[PDB]
């Protein structure tokens, strides 16, 4: 449905910290927006 | 003659009121009250890693 998109500003001031570190992107569609960026992308600015 | 009939007493259980916060399963959730939940329409949590 053209889902939402990640809010970059809101990031920078997290409301919590994810304890588990794991290779995400296996659990791809648990989210309706998943973006995987590598070194960095053009789309974050 | 005297003949009567007795009420030998009433027993009424009191249904125990159980909160949720006092319980084992309320560690597996972070519950918060959000009065405007009725108006929200769409909410989301971002998740960067």
């Amino acid at each position: 449905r053209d889902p939402p998109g990640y809010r970059y500003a809101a990031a920078m001031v997290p409301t919590g910290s994810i304890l588990s570190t794991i290779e995400v992107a296996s659990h791809r569609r648990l989210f309706d927006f998943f973006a995987r960026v590598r070194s960095d992308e053009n789309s974050l600015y | 003659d005297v003949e009567f009939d007795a009420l030998l007493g009433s027993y009424c259980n009191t249904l125990s009121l159980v909160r949720f916060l006092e319980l084992g399963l309320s560690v597996a959730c972070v519950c918060t009250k959000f009065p405007e939940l009725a108006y929200m329409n769409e909410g989301r949590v971002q998740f960067e890693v």
Side-chain angles (χ1 to χ4, degrees), chain B residues 10-21 23-47:
Chain B
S10 301
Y11 297 97
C12 166
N13 75 345
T14 84
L15 49 57
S16 64
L17 275 304
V18 294
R19 300 290 182 269
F20 178 70
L21 295 175
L23 195 140
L25 191 31
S26 51
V27 68
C29 58
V30 182
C31 291
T32 187
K33 296 179 180 177
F34 179 66
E36 295 83 358
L37 196 64
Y39 297 95
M40 216 222 298
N41 192 31
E42 293 177 350
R44 63 184 65 84
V45 179
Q46 65 193 11
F47 289 139

Side-chain angles (χ1 to χ4, degrees), chain A residues 10-22 24-40:
Chain A
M12 313 223 228
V13 180
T15 59
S17 63
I18 298 172
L19 299 175
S20 74
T21 56
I22 51 66
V24 171
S26 307
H27 304 103
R28 179 62 178 71
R29 298 175 182 174
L30 289 61
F31 301 83
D32 56 353
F33 175 81
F34 180 80
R36 202 168 107 120
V37 178
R38 78 176 314 172
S39 290
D40 87 337

